Design a protein around this ligand. Structure first.
Ligand code: ADP
Ligand code: ADP
Ligand code: MG
Lengths: 572, 290
């Protein structure tokens, strides 16, 4: 691939594909009509950032030369652009959602979130003060901040309802997620009476972001703090990608990993499958603007490709995250484990060079390994890495809270309740329905129904003291309905016959005054019965229903698996 | 190897390169008559089968000595153990023995530097480390599972202490125990260093129990109790030597009361060992019959 790249050095259109392999979020460079100079960079989701200093690929520069330059304008442009966004937001009427939303668009998803966290940090710092402000006061400062955001959230809480791009949609969804973290943290701070101020650990515990313009280098302008560890933003373009819900397990994990990086030790989150392990290491790297590479171990693993990759991990100072590490052939486990040991002993010592199989060692690099827990409290890491890693236990992800924020960003206004109901629901189906090997009631699955509920809510239309009450109740049941709609669309179709009365019954317990609706494909139903008579097929209600589940699902996933015992009606 | 004075040659088993250079340097090491050392050969379960067969019919010279190293791991073939003089290594019991092992890694050079309160803090760290590790021999009373609080945790905890002491007193001969952010100290050590590995919500409850007991300002007050029932309290001192002389005067035997557990915790332990033994004698007596 390097060769292909080199040769087609000037015929860029041909290299594009390989970018997803050298940059976290940069997927394609935007060229000029003549295709002779790079004007910017595109993300996989379609977002675009035009560089401040255009780069020419004709003027002379060879392959590495001009790529080394894009890498710089990437960082350069984003850093500069962050300042401009700080200056923009710095002057904007939070309530005027117009000029506000007007600002979210002038900048990359990546920066809008930082510009948001930089402010919040600084605002909270002032509220707490220099440790000389009667509680009551600081407490007022927080209500202010705590309330202000909750406002901004509502607006955004309505925007995601309005029709807009998948690009812009994921950007607000992201901001709805970060903003819930901001208020949630402040809320904590509000339950805190005796506060020391800008320095009370109830606040230094969290990750805060400080921008100090009165600093030479644009890169070195943003500095991230968490507890007592300090980081420089790497300014690697991430595109829109994903954001996790900063759940309390997440922040507890950020604290252990940042402390490990700060101690020049590796990260080792462990726990069962589906708890948010690899995903969290990915959100942290994205938070400090790093390039995070995840390596899948449960597969044919290339040792030879690893050697080559450790070299670039060390040279770029990028992050290597080995997923399900121990699910690796004992021989390769020792191979890689021995290489990690030489790099990690190198980091600990602080050397600027590594002796692997001398090379330069970027101080910002980091190795992370995830796996299931060991025997009775013991770690599954290999002896040689045990005293070189800081482990973090991730056994119970905060499902309720993930579901909740996850829905709020989808538009739902009763997300607190809905999440308190859809989570015990999944827990029940998981243990009170046939044990078919294909049922999946994990987080990922739980999120699919929430994201679908979202789309579905975009296609639906909602309907003295005693008044508000009726009114709330109505709107309330309205969203409950939207959630059941996704329950029927993506859940019961995979369920096997005997497990449909069980689910429908359960669903009733959790959503008392609301019941499953019949599918309204009035058109298709007729056509299907039009063909059924021709083919001699007895058109049965439970049978036509399945075809409609197929047509439904096919309008979503491009890959479907019709399943069941022989002569069950699949083919027909 | 140093002490004795003889060509020495180590090697860590696990790599591809590791296997060959070894079945050579060692082979040669034999006729010459020098020493060799493989470490963690257990990582090569499908390898010693060979090293065994070889070493067996590998007549050497008197002065030779092939020192291997391992962890009680079932991959080791019998023949390998049977053809050598096995030597077993176990962390002896007791808080006093625990403290001495910890101190080998706390050089007077690091511990004795200002503030004078630095040393007292290092001692509290060491005593903490001893308590949570001695309670490991009382599972499930001491802890719910076997958490591997290792020596690196201590080092890391010292790095953390050192950070805060250098922030609030860097250059001074004394630090104020109340100006220090103890909640910050306890949290880094509890949730990040020693407690990251805990997956239970009550074992975390227990670790902070000890953290909050030993890392608070009042712990610097003279005559701070560690084990009241026995009259043992923290010693006044500002140098490693002051603290070592206190350690060395402790009984070799510690009782669960030292660890915040009832004494009868020892009864369960002494019984489980009585069962393990009776159970063992019964095996080596069954076959002898069958
Ligand atoms: N804090 C979080 N916010 C949002 N989603 C999460 C969070 N934690 C986990 N998830 C979701 O749950 C799934 C967890 O799987 P993942 O972490 O990738 O596997 P593992 O936990 O086995 O490493 C992810 O697909 C992710 O979408
Ligand atoms: N709606 C229907 N009414 C009456 N008979 C049907 C209907 N659907 C299928 N059949 C008959 O039942 C059999 C079902 O087999 P089919 O579903 O095609 O295979 P599979 O279930 O292995 O995919 C067919 O041979 C067909 O003749
Ligand atoms: Mg068929």
């Amino acid at each position: 691939d390097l060769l292909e790249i080199i040769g087609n050095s000037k015929d860029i259109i041909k290299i594009q594909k390989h970018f997803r392999k050298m940059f976290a979020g940069l997927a394609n460079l935007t060229l000029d009509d003549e295709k002779t100079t790079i004007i910017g960079m595109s993300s996989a989701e379609g977002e675009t950032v035009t560089f401040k200093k255009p780069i020419s690929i004709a003027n002379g520069p060879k392959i590495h030369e001009w790529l080394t330059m894009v890498e710089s304008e990437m960082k350069s442009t984003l850093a500069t652009l962050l300042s401009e966004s700080l200056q923009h937001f710095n002057q904007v009427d939070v309530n005027d959602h117009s000029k506000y939303s007007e600002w979210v668009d002038n900048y990359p998803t990546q920066l809008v979130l930082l510009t948001s966290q930089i402010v919040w940090s600084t605002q909270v710092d002032q509220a707490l003060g220099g440790g000389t402000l009667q509680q009551s006061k600081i407490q007022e400062q927080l209500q202010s901040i705590e309330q202000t955001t909750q406002m901004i959230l509502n607006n955004l809480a309505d925007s995601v309802l309005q029709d807009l791009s998948a690009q812009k949609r994921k950007k607000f969804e992201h901001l709805i997620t970060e903003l819930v973290h901001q208020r949630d943290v402040v809320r904590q701070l509000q339950k805190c009476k005796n506060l020391t101020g800008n320095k009370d650990f109830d606040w230094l515990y969290h990750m805060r972001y400080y921008y100090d313009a009165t600093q030479e280098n644009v890169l070195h302008k943003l500095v991230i703090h968490m507890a007592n560890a300090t980081f420089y933003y790497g300014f690697e373009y991430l595109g829109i990608g994903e954001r996790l819900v900063q759940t309390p397990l997440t922040d507890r994990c950020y604290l252990t990993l940042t402390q490990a990086l700060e101690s020049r030790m590796g990260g080792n989150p462990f726990g069962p499958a589906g708890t948010g392990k690899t995903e969290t290491v990915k959100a942290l790297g994205s938070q400090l603007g790093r390039f995070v590479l995840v390596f899948c171990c449960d597969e044919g693993f290339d040792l030879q490709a690893m050697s080559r990759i450790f070299v670039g991990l060390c040279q770029c100072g990028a992050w290597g995250c080995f997923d399900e590490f121990n699910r690796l052939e004992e021989r390769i486990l020792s191979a890689v484990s021995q290489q990690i040991q030489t790099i990690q002993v190198a980091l600990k010592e602080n050397s600027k060079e590594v002796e692997l199989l001398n090379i330069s060692l970027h101080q910002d690099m980091g190795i992370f390994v995830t796996m299931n827990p060991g025997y009775a409290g013991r770690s599954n890491l290999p002896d040689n890495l045990k005293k070189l890693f800081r482990s973090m236990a991730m056994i119970k992800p905060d499902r309720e809270m993930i579901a909740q924020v996850m829905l709020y960003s989808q538009g739902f206004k009763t997300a607190e309740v809905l999440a308190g109901k859809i989570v015990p629901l999944f827990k029940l189906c998981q243990e009170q329905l046939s044990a078919q090997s294909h049922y999946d009631f994990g987080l990922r699955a739980l999120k699919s129904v929430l994201v679908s509920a979202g789309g579905i809510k975009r296609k639906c239309q909602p309907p003295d003291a005693e008044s508000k009450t009726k009114a709330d109740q109505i709107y309330c049941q309205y969203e409950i309905g939207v959630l059941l709609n996704s329950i029927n669309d993506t859940m019961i179709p995979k369920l096997v016959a005997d497990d449909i009365p069980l689910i429908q019954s359960l669903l009733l317990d959790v959503f008392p005054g609301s019941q499953l609706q019949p599918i309204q494909m009035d058109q298709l139903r007729k056509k299907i019965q039009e063909i059924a008579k021709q083919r001699h097929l007895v058109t049965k209600q439970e049978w036509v229903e399945k075809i409609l589940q197929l047509h439904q699902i096919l309008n979503i996933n491009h890959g479907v698996m019709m399943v069941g015992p022989s002569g069950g009606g699949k083919t027909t | 190897a140093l002490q004795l004075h003889k060509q020495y040659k180590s090697f860590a088993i696990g790599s591809p390169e590791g296997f060959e250079l070894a079945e050579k340097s060692i082979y040669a090491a034999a006729k010459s008559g020098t020493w060799v050392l493989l470490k963690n050969i257990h990582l090569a379960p499908q390898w010693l089968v060979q090293l065994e067969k070889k070493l067996h019919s590998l007549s050497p010279h008197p002065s030779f000595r092939l020192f291997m190293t391992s962890e009680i791991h079932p991959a080791l073939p019998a023949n390998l153990l049977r053809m050598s003089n096995v030597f077993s290594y176990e962390n002896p019991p007791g808080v006093k023995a625990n403290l001495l092992h910890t101190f080998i890694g706390i050089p007077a050079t690091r511990m004795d530097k200002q503030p004078a309160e630095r040393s007292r803090i290092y001692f509290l760290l060491a005593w903490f480390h001893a308590i949570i590790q001695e309670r490991l021999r009382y599972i499930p009373l001491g802890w719910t599972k076997f958490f591997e609080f290792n020596d690196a945790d201590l080092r890391g905890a010292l790095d953390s202490i050192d950070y805060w002491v250098d922030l609030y007193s860097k250059g001074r001969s004394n630090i104020d125990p109340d100006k220090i952010p103890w909640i910050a100290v306890r949290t880094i050590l509890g949730s990040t260093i020693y407690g990251g590995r805990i997956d239970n919500e009550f074992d975390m409850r227990l670790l902070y129990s000890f953290l909050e007991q030993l890392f608070t300002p009042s712990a610097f007050n003279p005559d701070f109790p560690l084990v009241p029932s026995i009259g043992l309290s923290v010693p006044e001192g500002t140098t490693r030597a002051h603290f070592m002389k206190w350690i060395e005067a402790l009984p070799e035997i510690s009782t669960p009361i030292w660890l915040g557990l009832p004494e009868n915790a020892e009864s369960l332990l002494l019984s489980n060992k009585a069962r393990k033994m009776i159970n063992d004698l019964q095996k080596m007596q069954s076959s002898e019959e069958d």
